[PDB]
Design a protein around this ligand. Structure first.
Ligand SMILES: Nc1ncnc2c1ncn2[C@@H]1O[C@@H]2COP(=O)(O)O[C@H]2[C@H]1O
Ligand SMILES: Nc1ncnc2c1ncn2[C@@H]1O[C@@H]2COP(=O)(O)O[C@H]2[C@H]1O
Ligand SMILES: Nc1ncnc2c1ncn2[C@@H]1O[C@@H]2COP(=O)(O)O[C@H]2[C@H]1O
Lengths: 201, 200
């Protein structure tokens, strides 16, 4: 589902394909381009020497990406953005976009609605990490990604596909610890695990 | 600035004393704020004697902007006046009417949202990669790297309460007390009255 405005915006971009796991944005690169996911999904990650990679968020079709450096020249990509599946994404220079903004501010309103949402979601994440114990953090995380578009409904909850590695990267724990906690969450009858498939209740 | 004075002329301004609450988490959001003077703390709570300051906002900063793009939303957090403040306020409706006239007012707001997203995202990385002790240790270091930080013959000197430290890391004031002591025995810092010396 799309609309005129959106299509108007798109007719000003170049759509490029990206195989699963390929990197769309490298942290540190000069920020001079805006992106738009027409198809597929991506992960946004940050790195910290020792411990390594952490997943800030998943973004999907309809999501803008690479927008954080738009309002001030000379900024660096604040994160790594990698394809989680085959992706088709539009791109336009900040300059051309700042122009379309003047033509029709609605395009900025749509981008802004998403930034506001991201700030609400990232803030909630900040709190969960500071206030929840590792158990609650993982328990909540399973609820969140159960809210993702790729989540398949279960005749008694919601079914998701995730790795102990990904969970650990979202909550900030090792896959070993995640496994041990998933065991408890299963025992406590809160989830059902079968391979890399989890059924959240 | 012509754009900002214009923006403000359409708002109603009010004075808020210290410790005063401008925004209550959970309430329906139908209005936007703009700090003309003063400072505020944006914070979230776990009502277990543990608060977390997501950020400080100052003169020239917008507040309550998160519920502007979708109706039926609630305030994502509590905003408390740090010092006396003069805050302009305007409903989302009138603000959306100003955006049509000149989108620049929206650009300025959005630039602040992007900065805020970048800063909060950095915070996320640290909290995930740090125990309560490490969070506090790193906070003492970061506080020593700031301009207002003072010089001490042994390194840097800072002034901050156990509560304030607790609000930064999201833990109890007592937890801060115990951690600061352990850090002393580790010969990493010194604590007397309300002054903390960070060696190095
Ligand atoms: N907390 C976050 N939530 C969602 N997307 C984010 C977050 N932090 C960064 N991003 C995205 O990661 C992108 C990579 O570089 P930019 O800073 O140009 O733009 C970034 C945002 O689109
Ligand atoms: N605080 C942390 N301790 C351990 N692993 C972490 C932490 N924060 C994030 N992680 C990531 O979580 C991942 C879980 O399993 P990996 O072997 O893939 O490598 C791990 C790290 O990259
Ligand atoms: N991470 C953050 N950084 C800065 N300000 C924030 C953050 N999270 C919330 N706020 C502010 O807290 C305000 C309170 O309610 P709103 O959600 O309407 O708008 C909010 C934002 O202006």
């Amino acid at each position: 589902q799309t609309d005129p405005t959106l299509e108007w915006f798109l007719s000003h971009c170049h759509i490029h394909k990206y195989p699963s796991k390929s990197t769309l944005i490298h942290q540190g690169e000069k920020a001079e381009t805006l992106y738009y996911i027409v198809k597929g999904s991506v992960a946004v990650l940050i790195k910290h020497e020792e411990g390594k990679e952490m997943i800030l968020s998943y973004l999907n079709q309809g999501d803008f990406i690479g927008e954080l450096g738009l309002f001030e020249e000379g900024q660096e990509r604040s994160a790594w953005v990698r394809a989680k599946t085959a992706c088709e994404v539009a791109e336009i220079s900040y300059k051309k976009f700042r122009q379309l903004i003047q033509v029709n501010p609605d395009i900025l309103m749509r981008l802004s609605a998403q930034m506001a949402r991201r700030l609400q979601v990232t803030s909630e994440k900040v709190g969960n990490l500071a206030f929840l114990d590792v158990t609650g953090r993982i328990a909540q995380t399973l609820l969140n990604l159960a809210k993702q578009p790729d989540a398949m409904t279960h005749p008694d909850g919601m079914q998701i596909k995730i790795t102990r590695q990904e969970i650990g990267q979202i909550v900030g724990c090792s896959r070993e610890t995640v496994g041990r906690i998933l065991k408890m969450l299963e025992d406590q009858n809160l989830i059902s695990a079968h391979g890399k498939t989890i059924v959240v209740y």
